[PDB]
């Protein structure tokens, strides 16, 4: 499937038909607690693009943790992805699913809005 997401990690390869180039990236995110900001996320990105191996680590506090999708993509394309791939230029619709994972993880305990209220959310009769 090329690109894949799981709670704790994201896999990246380019699907055939899109761009025939050797891009392979691993994105690991582990929420750790620092005494500075409290909650924060430690990220690791590693693979080999155009055959060039890389190992990268970047950390964002709870305040800018949800800004990850901008930076994680920025560093990925700096390693040899073009916007034609749909790196930052693709509106990731499942970003909201990753987003809600990370906001619950930062809280440590889960807290996912059940859609039963969303059924009532309307106005007419």
Q: Rounded to whole angstroms, what are the CA distances from 71 to 43, 65, 75, 115?
A: 11, 10, 6, 31
Residue 82's SS3 state is coil
How many CB atoms are closer than 10 A to CB 26? 13
Measured CA angle at 27 (ends 26, 29), to 5 deg: 145
Judge whether 10 and 24 are in contact, CB under 8 Å: no
Q: Can you tell me the distance from the alpha carbon of 44 to that of 88, in angstroms, rounded to the nearest whole number?
A: 19
Q: How far is CA 57 from the centre of its chain?
A: 14
Q: Can you tell me the distance from the alpha carbon of 64 to that of 8, in angstroms, rounded to the nearest whole number?
A: 18
The domains of the chain, with CATH numbers, are 1-125 (3.30.160.370)
Cβ partners under 8 Å of residue 17, min gap 6 = none
Residue with tokens 């392979």: 24
Q: Can you tell me the distance from the alpha carbon of 94 to that of 97, in angstroms, rounded to the nearest whole number?
A: 5
Scored b (16 or more CB within 10 A) or e, 68-94 reads beeebbebbbebbbeeebebbeeebee
Judge whether 56 and 44 are in contact, CB under 8 Å: yes
Q: Can you tell me the distance from the alpha carbon of 86 to that of 69, in angstroms, rounded to the nearest whole number?
A: 13
């Amino acid at each position: 499937q090329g690109h894949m997401f799981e709670p704790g990690h994201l896999h990246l390869v380019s699907l055939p038909g899109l761009d025939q180039q050797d891009i392979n990236i691993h994105i690991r995110y582990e929420v750790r607690q620092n005494a500075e900001s409290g909650a924060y996320v430690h990220f690791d990105m590693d693979g080999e693009i155009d055959g060039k191996p890389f190992s990268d680590s970047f950390e964002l506090p709870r305040d800018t943790a949800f800004n990850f999708a901008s930076d994680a993509t920025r560093v990925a394309q700096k390693h040899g992805l073009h916007p034609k791939f749909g790196a930052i230029t693709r509106v990731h619709k499942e970003y909201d699913a990753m987003f809600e994972d990370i906001r619950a993880k930062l809280h440590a305990h889960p807290g996912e809005p059940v859609d039963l209220e969303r059924i009532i959310r309307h106005e007419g009769s």
